[PDB]
């Protein structure tokens, strides 16, 4: 007789529901806390699952330590478990595969196994708009990248270089942070100057003179509002109604509206040349199945393409300025390269001459090695994936996290990895290179192997298409900085540590350097 025991299950439940509000709250906390803990212990039994990092608080998982110092988190985990391990992150299970094998396993994964758009769309679609990037099937993305690459050709870069140079000089002339016709020395915050210099140079050359002229007005404020939707807090709550969410949505309509306006006027005048990305997409945005991109979609694609490049590039020139500020030896060497290639300054900077500045391109390369703008790249796992040479299975619904930026900082692949050393790239100054066989996903032949320990631009179907644009812009900018200014730190200041909490891993500010003119009496012409 134990039906008598079932009587007391019933009675027991009855007394549960009758406990005071204090104990019941105490229990709605202690009961998932405990379940979680035995669940992990039970989980670590399975040999077909990668090791899972232990955590106390349910749902939150390892969010706090990962969110604040993800490379230290990765390293500590790698010591305990090796290169494959999992951890819970605000609701989700992230499986990290560290090292070159990890790049291979994730970047070169089969289309059917993983989805970038499933990982990213909830974050990007509201910022950029509907119908493009991650708000469309992968095949559509592939053709958009193709369309955009058509405004990123060598001949495009030859015409961008003087426009970008004009903008840097205008900024030296007019911005309160410099004013080189009035001041010979000054303090700047690189996280104030570099985003402005970036948006100004990127706008003028990819969007055109009209759009660049709008940045001189209050309209510029909308791009900032748009940033606030592109944060690792929309990370988790994609849409819950308070005000910076509205300003985001408002900015998107307003900016896309403006782009659509210029598009429609250019077509109404047949004022369609080869100046911009705008001209380019208007002439070339028909998918292979014959469907044309709408004017809304084109405008949304413009926002998305310029947003990403804006923050990665601005963060990178800020890090460059910061590393160089304590290396007058490297400024000196870069300066000598400038005098030699540009014949004392008597040659005008062109895209061709940029390619003959290996030490400048190595400086960019090395900065990107020590400061990858994105410490983590994600895919949602769509089908149970087996991990080669293990018994590990990664179930659908998990996420895979790859981190080439972590490998960038390993001594095994980069001797003295925490040292800024541009000469480690002697006779290897290329932004990237395919050491063999290629493949084409729809936007041109890129490398098939994604095993390089140096992968600032990722690889596989989702690979960056902006690398050459970014070197062009960073190149021109840094060439003018070097030729015009020397700079150094305020007393006792040094290279700041990264802030990893933002979307990109910019430096912890205020990040200030002191500039001074190389030629105090040099004037920059033009009306203002």
Ligand X SMILES: CCCN(CCOc1c(Cl)cc(Cl)cc1Cl)C(=O)n1ccnc1
Residue 141's binding partner among ligand X, ligand HEM, none (Cβ under 5 to 8 angstroms by kind) is ligand HEM
Q: Is 308 in the site for ligand X (CB under 6 A)?
A: yes
CA angle in degrees (0–180, nearest 5) for 344-345-351: 120
**Shortest Cβ distance from residue 470 to ligand HEM (Å)?**
4
Q: Which is nearer to ligand HEM, 184 or 284 (CB)?
A: 284
Binding residues for heme b: 120, 134, 145, 379, 462, 464
Residue 479's binding partner among ligand HEM, ligand X, none (Cβ under 5 to 8 angstroms by kind) is none
Residue 61's binding partner among ligand X, ligand HEM, none (Cβ under 5 to 8 angstroms by kind) is none
Q: How is residue 470 written in tokens? A: 């970014």
Q: Is 129 in the site for ligand HEM (CB under 6 A)?
A: no
Q: Which is nearer to ligand X, 120 or 223 (CB)?
A: 120
Binding residues: 120, 134, 145, 379, 462, 464
**How many Cβ atoms are within 10 Å of 277's Cβ, its own excluded?**
23
Q: Binding ligand X by CB under 6 A: which of 193, 205, 312, 484?
A: 312
Q: Which is nearer to ligand HEM, 313 or 331 (CB)?
A: 313
**How many Cβ atoms are within 10 Å of 108's Cβ, its own excluded?**
16
Residue 405's binding partner among ligand HEM, ligand X, none (Cβ under 5 to 8 angstroms by kind) is none
**Shortest Cβ distance from residue 470 to ligand X (Å)?**
9
β pairing state of 445-447 and 438-440: antiparallel
Q: Is 403 in the site for ligand HEM (CB under 6 A)?
A: no
Q: Which is nearer to ligand X, 276 or 337 (CB)?
A: 276
Q: Binding ligand X by CB under 6 A: which of 73, 378, 443, 469?
A: 378
Q: Is 124 in the site for ligand X (CB under 6 A)?
A: yes
User: What is the residue-wise DSSP string for 125-193?
Assistant: HHHH-TTSTTSS-HHHHHHHHHHHHTTSSHHHHHHHHHHHHHHHHHHHHH-TT--TTT-SEEEEEHHHH
Q: Binding ligand X by CB under 6 A: which of 321, 374, 400, 482?
A: 374
Task: Kindly give, in sequence order, each residue whose CB lies less than 8 Å from that of residue 279, ignoring residues fewer than 6 positions away.
Answer: 151, 208, 266, 272, 273
Residue 446's binding partner among ligand HEM, ligand X, none (Cβ under 5 to 8 angstroms by kind) is none
Q: Binding ligand X by CB under 6 A: which of 207, 302, 464, 485?
A: 464
Using CB under 6 A as the binding rule, the residues of this chain from 280 to 309 that contact ligand HEM are 305, 308-309
Alpha carbon distance 136, 307 (integer Å) = 18
Q: Binding ligand HEM by CB under 6 A: which of 469, 481, 487, 500?
A: 469
Closest among 269, 262, 276, 252 to 147, alpha carbons compared: 276
Query: Burial letters for 140-156: b for 16+ Cβ neighbours within 10 Å, e otherwise?
Result: bbbbbbbbbbebbeeeb
Q: Is 481 in the site for ligand HEM (CB under 6 A)?
A: no
Using CB under 6 A as the binding rule, the residues of this chain from 288 to 307 that contact ligand X are 304-305, 307
β pairing state of 114-115 and 377-381: antiparallel
DSSP state of 494: -
Q: Is 229 in the site for ligand HEM (CB under 6 A)?
A: no
Q: How is residue 189 written in tokens? A: 């915050």
Q: Which is nearer to ligand X, 359 or 377 (CB)?
A: 377
Alpha carbon distance 24, 343 (integer Å) = 80
Task: Reduce the DSSP state of residue 514 to 3 states and report it.
Answer: strand
Task: Reduce the DSSP state of residue 341 to 3 states and report it.
Answer: helix
Q: Is 102 in the site for ligand X (CB under 6 A)?
A: no
Q: How is residue 509 written in tokens? A: 């500010």
Q: Is 475 in the site for ligand HEM (CB under 6 A)?
A: no
Q: Is 465 in the site for ligand HEM (CB under 6 A)?
A: yes
Task: Kindly give, in sequence order, each residue whose CB lies less than 8 Å from that of residue 194, ignoring residues fewer than 6 positions away.
Answer: 314, 315, 317, 318, 321
Alpha carbon distance 280, 90 (integer Å) = 41
Alpha carbon distance 350, 94 (integer Å) = 45
CB 377 within 8 A of CB 106: yes
- Using the Cα atoms of residue 109, residue 115, residue 117 and residue 123 in order, give the sign of their dihedral: negative
Q: Which is nearer to ligand X, 133 or 349 (CB)?
A: 133
Q: Is 106 in the site for ligand X (CB under 6 A)?
A: no
Residue 123's binding partner among ligand X, ligand HEM, none (Cβ under 5 to 8 angstroms by kind) is ligand X
Alpha carbon distance 187, 180 (integer Å) = 12
**Shortest Cβ distance from residue 280 to ligand HEM (Å)?**
12
Q: Is 161 in the site for ligand HEM (CB under 6 A)?
A: no
Beta bridge partners of 292: 286
Binding residues for ligand X (CB under 6 A): 120, 123-124, 133, 304-305, 307-309, 312, 374, 376-378, 464
Binding residues for ligand HEM (CB under 6 A): 116, 141, 145, 305, 308-309, 312-313, 316, 368, 373-374, 377, 456-458, 462, 464-466, 469-470
């Amino acid at each position: 007789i134990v039906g008598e025991a079932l009587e007391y299950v019933n009675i027991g439940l009855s007394h549960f529901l009758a406990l005071p509000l204090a104990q019941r709250i105490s229990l709605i906390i202690i009961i998932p806390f405990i379940y979680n803990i035995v669940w992990q212990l039970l989980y670590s039994l399975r040999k077909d699952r990668p090791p899972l990092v232990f955590y106390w608080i349910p749902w939150v998982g390892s969010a706090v330590v990962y969110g604040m110092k993800p490379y230290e988190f990765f390293e500590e985990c790698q010591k305990k478990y090796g290169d494959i391990f999992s951890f819970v992150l605000l609701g989700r299970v992230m499986t990290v595969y560290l090292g070159p094998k990890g790049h291979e396993f994730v970047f070169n994964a089969k289309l059917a196994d993983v989805s970038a758009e499933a990982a990213y769309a909830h974050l990007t679609t509201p910022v950029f708009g509907k119908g493009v990037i991650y708000d469309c099937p992968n095949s559509r993305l592939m053709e958009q990248k193709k369309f955009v690459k058509g405004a990123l050709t060598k001949e495009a870069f030859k015409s961008y270089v003087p426009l970008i140079a004009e903008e840097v000089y205008k900024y030296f002339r007019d911005s309160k942070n410099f004013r080189l016709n009035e001041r010979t020395t000054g303090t700047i915050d690189v996280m104030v100057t570099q985003p402005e210099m970036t948006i100004f140079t990127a706008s003028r050359s990819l969007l055109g003179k009209e759009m660049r002229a709008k940045l001189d007005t209050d309209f510029a404020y909308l791009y900032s509002d748009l940033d606030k939707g592109f944060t690792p807090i929309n990370f988790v709550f994609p849409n819950l109604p308070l005000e910076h969410y509205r300003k985001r949505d408002h900015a998107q309509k307003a900016i896309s509206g403006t782009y659509m306006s210029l598009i429609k006027e250019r077509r109404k005048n047949n004022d369609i040349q080869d100046r911009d990305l705008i001209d380019s997409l208007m002439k070339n945005s028909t998918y292979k199945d014959g469907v044309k991109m709408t004017d809304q979609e084109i405008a949304n694609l413009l926002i998305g393409v310029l947003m990403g490049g804006q923050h990665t590039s601005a963060a990178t020139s800020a890090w460059i300025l910061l590393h160089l500020a304590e290396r007058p030896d490297v400024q000196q060497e870069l300066y000598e390269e400038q005098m030699r290639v540009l014949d004392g300054g008597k040659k005008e900077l062109t895209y061709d001459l940029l390619q003959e500045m290996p030490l400048l391109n190595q400086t960019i390369k090395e900065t990107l090695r020590m400061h990858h703008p994105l410490h983590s790249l994600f895919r949602k796992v769509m089908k149970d994936m087996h991990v080669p040479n293990t018994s590990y299975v990664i179930p659908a619904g998990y996420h895979v996290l790859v981190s080439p930026g972590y490998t960038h900082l390993r001594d095994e692949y980069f001797p003295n990895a925490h040292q800024f050393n541009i000469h480690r790239w002697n006779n290897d100054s290329a932004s990237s290179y395919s050491v063999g066989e290629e493949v084409d996903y729809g936007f041109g032949a890129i490398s098939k192997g994604v095993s390089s320990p140096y992968l600032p631009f990722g690889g596989g179907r989702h690979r960056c298409i902006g690398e050459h644009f970014a070197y062009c812009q960073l190149g021109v900018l840094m060439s003018i900085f070097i030729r015009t200014l020397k700079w150094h730190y305020p007393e006792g200041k040094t290279v700041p540590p990264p802030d990893f909490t933002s979307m990109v891993t910019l430096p912890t500010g205020p990040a200030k350097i002191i500039w001074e003119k190389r030629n105090p009496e040099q004037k920059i012409g033009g009306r203002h």
